[PDB]
Amino acid sequence: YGSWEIDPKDLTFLKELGTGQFGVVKYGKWRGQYDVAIKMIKEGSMSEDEFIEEAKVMMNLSHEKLVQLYGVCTKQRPIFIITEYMANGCLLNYLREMRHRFQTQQLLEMCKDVCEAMEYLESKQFLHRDLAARNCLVNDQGVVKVSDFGLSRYVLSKFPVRWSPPEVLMYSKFSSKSDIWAFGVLMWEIYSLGKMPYERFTNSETAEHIAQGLRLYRPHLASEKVYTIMYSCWHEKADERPTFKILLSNILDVMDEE
């Protein structure tokens, strides 16, 4: 077993957590003690040799706001991806649970959690490529962490039109600034309590809306200062969009002011 390889015999499978682009994900214990999530990679769903090589890179990505990859189980099929377990599940579902009665201070903290993870990824020149509330998870302390960063590169209609800047929709130009755009949409999702962006539109109509220069608008729960931050992510010119370091400074400033 290499450093990126976990012995599957050390796993105890306990509960089912959900299903994604690679199949079922389960909750379990590693060595009878430590909580883990276990992705069971359905056959034919993943470019497996490419993912395994990239897993070595993902293992060195370590930040408190990034769902940690613990290792992979590659000797048998289906292969397993072993990650940090996040007791409160997907951020999108969490936002939609009205019982939480969130204060806007909590919503801004969720934005800060994600922005810290994204500043770290940016500092490593690592793109998420599908940043959205569906790819954020929530732990038992209510901390939001960014999950499954980069994994879309290995997945073999469902394109994230609603999280994509004009240059991606028009020319497939992905960059740090397409992650920035997506982060702005994610802030909108958070402050909208999990509403679908451009909810009245199809993907095709969303693409045309964006191409014409029109935009999402201010969620009811976003202050003017918060709206300014999310809107800055949507500049038509990618080079005029902020970095994650600047967004983080702007978020911290708003936390101090509000």
Ligand SMILES: O=C(NCc1ccc(-c2ncnc3[nH]ccc23)cc1)c1ccccc1
């Ligand atoms: O596998 C994917 N998505 C399904 C998914 C992912 C994570 C979790 C999960 N991880 C940790 N703790 C948890 N607690 C509750 C859920 C849960 C569950 C399901 C995926 C594949 C490729 C690209 C993007 C996503």
